[PDB]
């Protein structure tokens, strides 16, 4: 029984792995995922410049999950760049995931052809849940700004390359969304970022400072609508695009039904945040316990094979 | 301590109530909520002609909330008409909700142009999480559609009517949105309908028969998304236009911070579904203790005042 | 013959040290200095949080000096207070200067209120060359806000403060900022930080990356206005206030000048970057030869003695 | 491989000449630049009446550069204009600028009246790195009199008119420098003056006598500044507003830079005072030297082209 896997031509130890803009906003803390059962790491999400991000708390925790407001704080896309760059030439050297987007179009494509000039081969995530033009939401809604942006960056950029997502909740989105990604080689989709613009209290008051109290959702709020986005792009696009899932994900049963799902890969991020790294060791056991109840040997013996009902 | 509330020019003994869709479908669910602690009913979502719905089983229960795709199953609008007609002339009658909506724009109007020649004058919500045309999301989701339809309704439709809405998930759609509510003469909006297209599964088969297992997520997975929507049309809405809160609630603090966020009106549904018309007279009781303890003598006290932080 | 001197009520061994934001990045490096002949050390300028700066190069020498855009790295203002704090409690201890700034002045205060908070007692140099709000110069450029600072800053602060200076350039402005100064119980104030905002070409081509080739100017460029500077607030600001002198050093003569200027203490800078901690020994010898050949003792024979024409 | 410019109308057959108050006292000190290689002159700054300037030594050489404060010592602004007018009519007269200023605002508009109603034609060069009122900055620190002035000027003035600056090192100040300049027909700004109210000692005293022995620096100390004075408003002024550069230049390499930059035309203080007039010579060829090497055939093929990296 084995919980190895794989995403575009990389292969992990494992299938679990923090979600991006937890856990990583250091070299200190990305090293602490290394050496946790974490399959792989993926960089706090970086832009061009460094950024302080929103004011505090910007964070909060819930009986249920979290809410956030961040304001993409990092430390550079050069300090992370440098970073997974130089983790390559190390031996026994994990394949990890570089997460960037710019505060603009413009921004997103000088931090992309940096990294493409630059000596890093390994995965990269475009955050696209991302800061449009006044009077336009976030880019991933706009599906016209959406492949103006991938067409874009394909006709430069030749490093593997993946997506992530917010959840969309209307069929016809999943079609529209899917008729777009499937038409680049992406290496993969993930779904799903937070629950946008999510509201908070405690007692009467909002419970973050950023933007009113209104913040992104994560943890047991939000399987429903992860698991629905990973199975919903599974059926609709072409296999040569993965999908990892991200999303409530809490113990070995939730890991499992994203796999179930589609997912090759399966992200952490309000649990990781709340439980700290120590949180793949039991997740990975908790999965694995499925797996052998099962009768499963690897990822492939069920990911994808999620039953319909009579 | 009071829990008395309006909606337009409509007084209520309380201020909860079903959610449309559950404990409604006939005459005697109808009464027994309205012989319940229950301000106010709202209809089953009637379309034209009767409908079956889709096959069984069409919901399931969840430990944090329940999932479903029931088609829209109904008795049919004269059903529901006749009996909110009938229900005005009796004494001691409590204001209710008709809700309705058209499998296509057109039948929408059919409806619509029915009550608005009948002898109701009471409440009318029209469920805008409705069919479109393929190729185009729900109703909703739509704001060309929505804000055709809209304007088309008011060219001859003069009873008091509201909107029920899908959540929303960004800042622009919330702008977008308001920016048609607001042209016209509705007298509420409902916050909200279920969160789309969610996905449970109960070992490695959905739970539900129809739609693949994607069906409107409800309960406690919703409460933020809920309270968001509420707060985020009180903060955009013009005050003539007010907000019934729907989503999350199963306790009196629920309730409590839907009004917090400017619902003149809180809605159960999942809770009302597994609990039974019972728990109006508890979660009546919850609220008031709350605020009992707060020194909040009507809803007018708190209603809209949710703090920022500091 | 004894290049021992005092800044406020501290004492130090000998009368030259680094410059802020050279040769004082990390502990090994400061410890470099404080083993070094150098009479003190002050930390890399430190923010509330650390900071990678701008991108590289942002640093490049010429026959005549330096040309720099940092960007302010540094590792955090909690890593350079912890360490100052800790070299506090050894024997033989050094006495040191903690530099910091904040991006913005709600920034610094908070900064400052931590420093006032912590065990450190030593001397601190306020960065005065900071970013302002937006069409607005450097804050030391900006008296109207330079007045604000101070007087907010010195309502809580009581450790030993002073000021790191951008050069002036004309009697107005001085008079204007030796006011300002005049007002507060600052220890010291630091003549001068780079002369902002050259350009250095090699070949056709700027020769820094950051900020279109343009930044600080250090070395030889500089000892004129260093030396005027020092001076101007030497004749200006009240005794309470001592000058430390920056800029331009690199022989004991250049430091012997700025002495002579009123300087109770020199700092190195460009050449400190250029020769290593090892420019101390040599330039400490070199000032010592001219106390020597001219009979003088102590600092005091000729600090602030520089003569005017007959 | 050509060096010859253009200021406004008017054409020079060399893009080097003197900075104001370099080698430009008298009538005599003039022509030997006329008759030099330099391909034009700035008279010394002019007052209305004339000036014996600052207590000497005003004036001191450095391994790197200058440092002076002079005071505006000159013969009087009717001695320079009756020169420059009186050369106009001579035959292969080349074209020259007036550098003119008042001790105070008002005496600036009498001059510049002067000059107005004269029968000169030719460039002027208005000084605005000098001081005038009390509690107030040299003038071209003082935005709100910079505009005031320059508003003024402007309603009678119909000369070609360009103004000396000073140096600035904030962004923000090129900004609000530029977005007055603009305003206005300035034919041309020249950076810059010299870094003011520098320090120079020799053993314990300083090396010049006014002033306490503060100064205007020039020479090696300023090219960094005078580049990033010259390329700041390159980038910022509307190109009917050319730009001359000074500061810094001793070799055809730092008058190719300030070229680079944005320069039209270039001038050399500290210098030319140290080697006289000869200096054109050499330094035109240096100049040319490397156009050849480059490839370039006139100004115009590298006038701005400076890259970032
Ligand atoms: C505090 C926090 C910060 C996050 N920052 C980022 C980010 O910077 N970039 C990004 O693409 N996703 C970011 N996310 C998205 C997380 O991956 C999100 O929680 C995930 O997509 C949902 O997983 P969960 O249920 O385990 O929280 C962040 C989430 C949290 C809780
Ligand atoms: C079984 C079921 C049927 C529903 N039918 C309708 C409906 O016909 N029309 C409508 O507008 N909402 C319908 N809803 C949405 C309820 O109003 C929904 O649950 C509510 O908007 C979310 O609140 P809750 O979290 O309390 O369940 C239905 C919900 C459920 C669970
Ligand atoms: C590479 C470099 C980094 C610097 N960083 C800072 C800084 O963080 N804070 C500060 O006040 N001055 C900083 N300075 C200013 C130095 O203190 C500056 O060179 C000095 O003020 C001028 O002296 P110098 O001629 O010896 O170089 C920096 C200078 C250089 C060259
Ligand atoms: C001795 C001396 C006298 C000067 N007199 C004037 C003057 O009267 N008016 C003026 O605008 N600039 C005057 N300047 C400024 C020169 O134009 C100045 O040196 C030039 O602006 C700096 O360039 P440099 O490095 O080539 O010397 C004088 C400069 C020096 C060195």
């Known amino acids: 029984?084995?919980?190895?896997?794989?995403?575009?031509?990389?292969?992990?130890?494992?299938?679990?792995?923090?979600?991006?803009?937890?856990?990583?906003?250091?070299?200190?803390?990305?090293?602490?995922?290394?050496?946790?059962?974490?399959?792989?790491?993926?960089?706090?999400?970086?832009t061009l410049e460094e950024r302080a991000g929103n004011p505090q708390p910007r964070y909060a925790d819930t009986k249920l999950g979290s809410i956030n407001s961040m304001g993409l704080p990092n430390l550079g896309i050069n300090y992370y760049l440098d970073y997974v760059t130089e983790l390559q030439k190390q031996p026994?050297?994990?394949?990890?995931?570089?997460?960037?987007?710019?505060?603009?179009?413009?921004?997103?494509?000088?931090?992309?052809?940096?990294?493409?000039?630059?000596?890093?081969?390994?995965?990269?995530?475009?955050?696209?849940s991302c800061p449009n033009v006044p009077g336009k939401p976030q880019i991933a809604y706009d599906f016209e700004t959406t492949d103006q942006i991938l067409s874009e960056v394909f006709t430069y950029f030749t490093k593997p390359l993946g997506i992530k997502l917010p959840p969309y909740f209307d069929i016809v989105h999943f079609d529209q969304a899917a008729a777009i990604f499937n038409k680049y080689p992406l290496t993969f989709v993930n779904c799903i970022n937070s629950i946008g613009n999510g509201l908070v209290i405690e007692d009467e008051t909002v419970v973050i400072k950023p933007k009113n109290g209104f913040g992104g959702i994560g943890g047991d709020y939000v399987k429903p609508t992860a698991l629905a986005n990973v199975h919903a792009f599974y059926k609709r696009l072409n296999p040569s695009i993965q999908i990892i899932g991200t999303g409530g994900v809490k113990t070995g049963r939730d890991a499992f039904e994203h796999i179930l799902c589609g997912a090759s890969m399966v992200q952490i991020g309000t649990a990781l945040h709340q439980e700290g790294p120590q949180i793949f060791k039991r997740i990975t056991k908790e999965l694995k316990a499925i797996?052998?109840?099962?009768?499963?040997?690897?990822?492939?013996?069920?990911?994808?094979?999620?039953?319909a009902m009579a």
Do not use: W
């Not at 797996?291 to 039953?307: A, S, V």
């Open 1 to 46: 029984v084995s919980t190895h896997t794989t995403i575009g031509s990389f292969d992990f130890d494992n299938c679990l792995m923090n979600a991006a803009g937890v856990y990583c906003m250091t070299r200190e803390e990305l090293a602490a995922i290394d050496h946790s059962e974490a399959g792989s790491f993926v960089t706090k999400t970086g």
């Open 92 to 128: 026994d050297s994990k394949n990890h995931f570089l997460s960037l987007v710019g505060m603009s179009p413009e921004e997103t494509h000088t931090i992309l052809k940096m990294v493409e000039a630059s000596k890093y081969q390994g995965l990269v995530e475009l955050n696209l």
């Open 291 to 307: 797996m052998t109840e099962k009768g499963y040997e690897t990822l492939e013996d069920f990911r994808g094979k999620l039953n």
